[PDB]
Amino acid sequence: ARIFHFNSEVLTSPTMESTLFKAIQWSKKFGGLIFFDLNLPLPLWRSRNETRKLIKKSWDEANIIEVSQQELEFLLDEEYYERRRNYTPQYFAEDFEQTKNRRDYYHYTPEEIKPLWHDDLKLLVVTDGTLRLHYYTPKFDGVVVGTEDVLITPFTCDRTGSGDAVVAGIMRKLTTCPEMFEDQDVLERQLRFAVAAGIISQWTIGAVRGFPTESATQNLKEQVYVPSMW
Amino acid sequence: GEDATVDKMCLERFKVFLKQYNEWVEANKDRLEEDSYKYDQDFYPGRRIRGK
C-alpha cells in the first residue's frame, strides 16, 4: 500500500489505537503515506482540549489530513469563527463584494493553521462540503471553488457518503499524480475531480449505492467547469 | 513682546481648571476607551478616536 488511510473512530478503542500505531510504524517503514481522515464521532465533540490531546499523536503521525470546516473550527476555536461569521459593519462595507451578503467562504490563513501544522504534513485539506476545498501545503495554500446541486433530484438526493467520495477522489489523484504535492495548479486541477466525485455521490440514496465511477466523475467535472479549468 | 510672555499671564483659575482636568483625564482615560469599545462597534467620524 502506498497510502494508509484511517479515521479517528479507532481512537475511541484502545486495542485499535495500539494496532493502528503499530500499523502506522509498519507502513512508514515500507514507504507508505499516512492519510488521517478525522471524521470525529459523537464522543469527540465534547470539548476541544480533550479531543486535541486524544488526536495529537495520530495527527503528528499523518502526512495527509482531511478535516471538515466544522472539525477544523472546533479544533482551533469555535466561538471566534462564529463571531467572525456574524460580524456586520455598522455604517458601510469595506468593499462592494461585502455588500452582497453572500455565503461566507472564509479561507483560513496558514498562521491560523500553525498550531495544527507539523513537519511531516505534506497536504492538509479543509472541506466545506463540496462547495469549498481549502488546501494547505508547506509551500503554498489556496482554495478550490466547487458547487453542489441536490435540488436537481429532490426525491433521490442523500448526502451520506459524499465526504467518502471526496477523500477517495483525493487518494485516487494522489496515487497517480505525484506532482500534486508540489504544483499548485496541478493540485487544484486534480482536486476538482474529487469535487465532482463528491457532487455525484449526493444524488443517490445510500452511501455505497451512490458512489460514482471514474467515467461519470470525469464527465461531470468537464461539464461543470470551463475547459481551461480541466 | 516681552510684556505679553506667559509668565505675566493672570490665568490662575484656568490653571486650577487645567490641573483638575489633567487629574480627571488620567483617572478616566482608560474607562472611556473601554466604554467606547463596548458601545460603538465600528469607528465613525464623531466617535471616540481609540486603538492605535
Side-chain angles (χ1 to χ4, degrees), chain B:
Chain B
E2 296 165 337
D3 306 357
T5 282
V6 186
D7 62 351
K8 212 249 184 182
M9 284 333 177
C10 178
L11 329 168
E12 280 66 69
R13 300 144 151 89
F14 199 100
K15 286 176 199 57
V16 181
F17 156 68
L18 272 170
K19 70 167 270 291
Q20 265 163 125
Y21 165 81
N22 278 112
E23 182 195 16
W24 172 88
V25 159
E26 296 314 307
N28 297 31
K29 178 155 40 76
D30 297 350
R31 191 196 75 259
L32 294 178
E33 193 145 335
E34 277 160 312
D35 272 5
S36 168
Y37 268 121
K38 198 156 56 54
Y39 294 133
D40 303 326
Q41 176 211 81
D42 278 330
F43 175 80
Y44 197 77
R47 300 286 88 209
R48 180 175 180 90
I49 302 169
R50 67 216 183 176
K52 268 111 54 185

Side-chain angles (χ1 to χ4, degrees), chain A residues 161-186:
Chain A
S162 308
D164 301 317
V166 176
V167 166
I170 292 167
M171 277 174 356
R172 170 85 178 116
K173 282 321 171 172
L174 276 182
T175 39
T176 60
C177 200
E179 304 86 42
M180 267 167 91
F181 286 118
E182 299 294 318
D183 203 347
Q184 188 166 192
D185 173 47
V186 171

Side-chain angles (χ1 to χ4, degrees), chain A residues 25-127:
Chain A
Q25 312 168 12
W26 275 114
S27 200
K28 290 218 176 203
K29 147 175 209 52
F30 296 127
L33 294 172
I34 309 304
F35 200 126
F36 193 11
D37 171 31
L38 216 70
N39 289 15
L40 291 180
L42 208 159
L44 292 201
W45 291 99
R46 179 199 308 272
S47 54
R48 168 184 89 252
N49 294 329
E50 89 212 290
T51 309
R52 293 276 307 261
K53 309 334 154 213
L54 274 160
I55 74 160
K56 171 145 179 57
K57 197 176 157 197
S58 54
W59 189 281
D60 304 323
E61 284 308 305
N63 305 89
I64 317 144
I65 295 174
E66 193 272 322
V67 282
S68 84
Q69 176 208 300
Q70 294 71 38
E71 275 158 17
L72 180 90
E73 282 169 2
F74 171 79
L75 286 180
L76 297 175
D77 198 359
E78 244 178 335
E79 292 47 17
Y80 169 74
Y81 288 109
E82 220 275 2
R83 279 185 267 115
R84 190 209 33 87
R85 264 196 310 279
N86 292 339
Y87 170 86
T88 302
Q90 206 173 345
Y91 304 105
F92 46 87
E94 280 305 308
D95 47 358
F96 176 82
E97 310 298 317
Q98 198 201 318
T99 69
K100 295 278 163 113
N101 304 297
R102 288 171 178 150
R103 192 195 187 263
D104 218 6
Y105 301 112
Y106 171 65
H107 176 60
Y108 314 93
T109 73
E111 295 71 59
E112 281 163 323
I113 307 284
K114 218 79 82 173
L116 289 172
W117 207 258
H118 57 78
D119 306 56
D120 277 357
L121 198 46
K122 306 190 89 208
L123 166 79
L124 164 81
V125 177
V126 194
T127 64

Side-chain angles (χ1 to χ4, degrees), chain A residues 169 192-198 200 211-223:
Chain A
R192 296 185 181 111
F193 178 89
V195 169
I200 292 168
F211 281 141
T213 64
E214 180 179 28
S215 192
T217 297
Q218 185 64 29
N219 275 335
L220 187 89
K221 180 197 164 170
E222 295 185 2
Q223 289 157 18

